[PDB]
């Protein structure tokens, strides 16, 4: 019933910068508001409870403020360990709803992806299926577009993508896109290509191969 | 040291039931309102239910109301979550957590468990098929090449991938799996490597899938074309 709306979706900042995260309630939540930090393979962690109170062991660079319907979590100096996903939660109504989360990520210089295409193996084709993999390695920002073309025809609904999590050392992302087909359908075409659009590429990059031809 | 430990997780068919348990270590339980929170793959945190400190009242999230029951057994020192009529969307990591009392409800949730995976699916436990993503599909020459392993069609909880028995970590990207329309999982593990090393250095990916107790070691070679 009470809708929690967090803004922005992503915050791209450098370590040492001030981060200000917003949480809006659809109606008054009076003190029944908590803030959480969530790191990829870890349990959520309580930062602030009761709008303003810092939990045990939470560093004083984290602070909560606001009232009624408008709340803020301020991280005064982003240390490298504060780059995480942040949620607010309300306990004022029936059903204690969370916001959608605000991801705080490392802003770094634009890096273009190195692009690689992999045809299906002979081992896989013998099974009756064919998977063509497009790898986009070490790029930043996260936003990238991958398009599959089969004999110059644009594909839809037959590929799936996966992204890695901002890299600890270089602050980049890697993306894998898999085009999946039956051996029957794969054999009906010659040119398999993935076209990549990214901010770091002056124009889209295309990687191709012809079926059979090594 | 205060702790919460969830148990009861695993694989359940859609339409069936699963009962999750939570055990408190080092503290009360009887004077705290206890919650369940979940996180579905690729989605955000979602509050599931609460049971009053008292055991007198219960509240549920809109997507689970009617199907789930949260309960507290102070004799067995346990918190349970009975999940009936499960659907594929109920596949998530489930956390047992303790509320901070405050006012007529809570101010926050301070102590959380490690979480437990609940996979709601009708698929059968299957080990992965490991296919090579052979290097330099065009040119080698100068420097740096990409190779990998396609870990396809498995059904479990997870798979673990390592390269050269853990000796190769530098430039490795093991991707989050994707749940395919078949209800089976698939992932790729890639590694960036010097082109000069392709003829000499051996690259093997070590795929281990505990749920079907299968171990596969696939050697990744450049495709010898003739």
CB A9 within 8 A of CB A93: no
Nearest alpha-carbon partner for B31 in B84, B85, B77? B77
Q: Distance of CA B70 to CAs A214, B23, B84, B107, Å?
A: 59, 14, 12, 20
| Nearest of B197, B7, B182 to residue B96 by alpha carbon | B7
How far apart are the CA of B16 and the nearest CA of chain A, in angstroms?
A: 25
Q: Shortest CA distance to A194 belongs to which of A120, A112, A118?
A: A118
Phi, psi of B48 (to 5 degrees): -100, -60
Determine if the peptide bond prior to A120 is cis (ω within 30°).
Answer: no
Using the 8-state DSSP alphabet, how is residue A47 labeled? E
Distances (CA, A) of A31 to A1, A57, A89, A152: 17, 21, 11, 58
H, E, C per residue of B134-174? CCCCCCCCCCCEEEEEEEEEEECCCCEEEEHHHCECCCEEE
Q: What is the DSSP string of B1-32?
A: --EEEEE--EEE-TTS-EEEEEEEESS-STTS
How far apart (Å, rounded) are the C-alpha atoms in residues A104 and A108? 13
Joined together, the tokens standing for residue A57 give 């062991």
| Coil vs helix vs strand at A19 | strand
Strand partners, B84: none
Cβ(A103)–Cβ(A6) under 8 Å?
no
Report the run of H or E that residue B129 belongs to, with start and end: strand B129-133
Q: How many residues does chain A have?
A: 214
One DSSP character per residue, A151-165 reads: TTEEP-SSEEEEE--
The number of C-alpha atoms within 13 Å of B212 and in the hemisphere containing its C-beta is 20
What six digits make up the tokens of B57?
Answer: 């009242």
Say if CB B113 and CB B95 are below 8 A apart: yes
Burial class from Cβ neighbours inside 10 Å (0-12, 13-18, 19+) for residue A160 reads middle
Q: Does A116 touch chain B (CB under 8 A)?
A: yes
In this structure, the number of other CB atoms found within 10 A of the CB of residue A16 comes to 9
d(C-alpha A99, C-alpha A85), whole Å: 11
**Interface check A30 vs B, CB under 8 A:** yes
CA distance A130 to A181: 5
Count other Cβ atoms within 10 Å, centred on residue A41.
Answer: 7
| Alpha carbon distance B25, B5 (integer Å) | 8
Distance set, CA B205 to CA A68, A175, B131 (Å):
54, 19, 10
Alpha-carbon A181 to chain mean position: 27
Tokens of B37: 């929170």
Q: What is the DSSP string of B189-200?
A: EEEEE-GGGTTT
3-state secondary structure of A38: strand
- Rounded (to 5) percent helix, strand, coil in chain A: 5, 50, 45
CB A115 within 8 A of CB A194: yes
Within 8 A by CB and 6+ apart from A67, the residues are A51
The experimental technique used to determine this model is X-ray
Size of interface A-B (CB pairs under 8 A): 155
Measured between alpha carbons, how far is B142 from B149 in angstroms, rounded to an integer? 24
- Best to test chain B binding among A31, A33, A43 (most B CBs inside 10 Å): A43
Q: What are phi and psi of A122, to 5 degrees?
A: -70, -30
Whether B87 contacts B14, CB under 8 Å: yes
Q: Which residues of A touch B176 (CB under 8 A)?
A: 162-164
Task: Choose among A3, A9, A65: nearest CA to A28.
Answer: A3
User: After which residue numbers is chain B interrupted with C–N beyond 2.5 angstroms?
Assistant: none
Assign A25 to helix, strand or coil. Answer: strand
Full set of structural domains in chain B with CATH: 1-122 (no CATH), 123-226 (2.60.40.10)
Residues 6+ apart with CB under 8 A from B190: A135, A137, A174, A176, B133, B146, B147, B148, B172, B173, B175
CA distance to partner chain B, nearest, from residue A28 (Å): 14
A1-108 sits in which CATH class?
Answer: mainly beta
Instruction: Collect all residues with Cβ–Cβ distance below 8 Å to B65 and sequence separation of at least 6.
Output: none
The separation between CA B113 and the C-alpha centre of its own chain, rounded to angstroms, equals: 15
Helix residue spans in chain A (DSSP H): 122-125, 183-186
> Do B55 and B49 meet the contact criterion of CB atoms below 8 Å apart?
no
Q: Token match 């917003």: residue?
A: A22
Q: Is B211 exposed, middle or buried (0-12, 13-18, 19+ CB in 10 A)?
A: middle
From B47, B138, B190, residue closest to A97, measured CB to CB: B47
Are B110 and A55 in contact, with CB atoms under 8 Å apart? yes
The resolution in Å comes to 2.5
Token pair for A100: 């959608």
Q: What is the bridge-based pairing of β-strands A102-106 and A10-13?
A: parallel
Domain boundaries, chain A: 1-108, 109-214
* A109-214 CATH: 2.60.40.10
Up-side HSE of residue A27: CA atoms within 13 Å toward CB? 7
């Amino acid at each position: 019933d009470i809708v929690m709306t967090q803004s922005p979706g992503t915050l791209s900042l450098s370590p040492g910068e001030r981060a200000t995260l917003s949480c809006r309630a659809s109606q008054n939540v009076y003190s029944y508001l908590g803030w959480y930090q969530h790191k990829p393979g870890r349990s959520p962690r309580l930062l602030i409870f009761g709008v303003t109170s810092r939990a045990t062991g939470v560093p004083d660079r984290f602070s909560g403020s606001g009232s009624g319907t408008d709340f803020t979590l301020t991280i005064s100096r982003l240390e490298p360990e504060d780059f995480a996903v942040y949620y607010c939660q309300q306990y004022a109504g029936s059903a204690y709803t969370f916001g959608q989360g605000t991801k705080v990520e490392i802003k770094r210089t634009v890096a273009a992806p190195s692009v690689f295409i992999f045809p299906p193996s002979d081992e896989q084709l013998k099974s009756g299926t064919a998977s063509v993999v497009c790898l986009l390695n070490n790029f930043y920002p996260r936003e990238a577009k991958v398009q599959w073309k089969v004999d110059n025809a644009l594909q839809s609904g037959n590929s799936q993508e996966s992204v890695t999590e901002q890299d600890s050392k270089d602050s980049t992302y890697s993306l894998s896109s898999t085009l999946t087909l039956s051996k029957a359908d794969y054999e009906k075409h010659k040119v398999y290509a993935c076209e990549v659009t990214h901010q770091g590429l002056s124009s889209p990059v295309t990687k191709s191969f012809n079926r059979g031809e090594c | 040291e205060v702790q919460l430990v969830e148990s009861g997780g695993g694989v359940v068919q859609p339409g069936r039931s699963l009962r999750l348990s939570c055990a408190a270590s080092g503290f009360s339980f009887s004077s705290y309102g206890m919650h369940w929170v979940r996180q579905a793959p690729g989605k955000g945190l979602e509050w599931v239910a609460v049971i009053w400190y008292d055991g007198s009242k219960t509240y549920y999230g809109d997507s689970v109301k009617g199907r789930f029951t949260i309960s507290k057994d102070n004799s067995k020192k346990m918190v349970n979550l009975q999940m009936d009529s499960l659907g594929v969307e109920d596949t998530a990591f489930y956390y047992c957590a303790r509320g901070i009392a405050g006012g007529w409800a809570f101010w926050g949730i301070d102590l959380w468990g490690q979480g437990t995976l609940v996979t709601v699916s009708s698929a059968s436990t299957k080990g992965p098929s490991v296919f090579p993503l052979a290097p330099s599909s065009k040119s080698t020459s100068g420097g740096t090449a990409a190779l990998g392993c396609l870990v396809k069609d498995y059904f479990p909880e997870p798979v673990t991938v390592s390269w050269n028995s853990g000796a190769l970590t530098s430039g490795v990207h093991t991707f989050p799996a994707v749940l395919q329309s078949s209800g089976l999982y698939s992932l790729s593990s890639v590694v960036t490597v010097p082109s000069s090393s392709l003829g000499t250095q051996t690259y093997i990916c070590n795929v281990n899938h505990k749920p079907s107790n299968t171990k596969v070691d696939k050697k990744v070679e450049p495709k010898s074309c003739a």
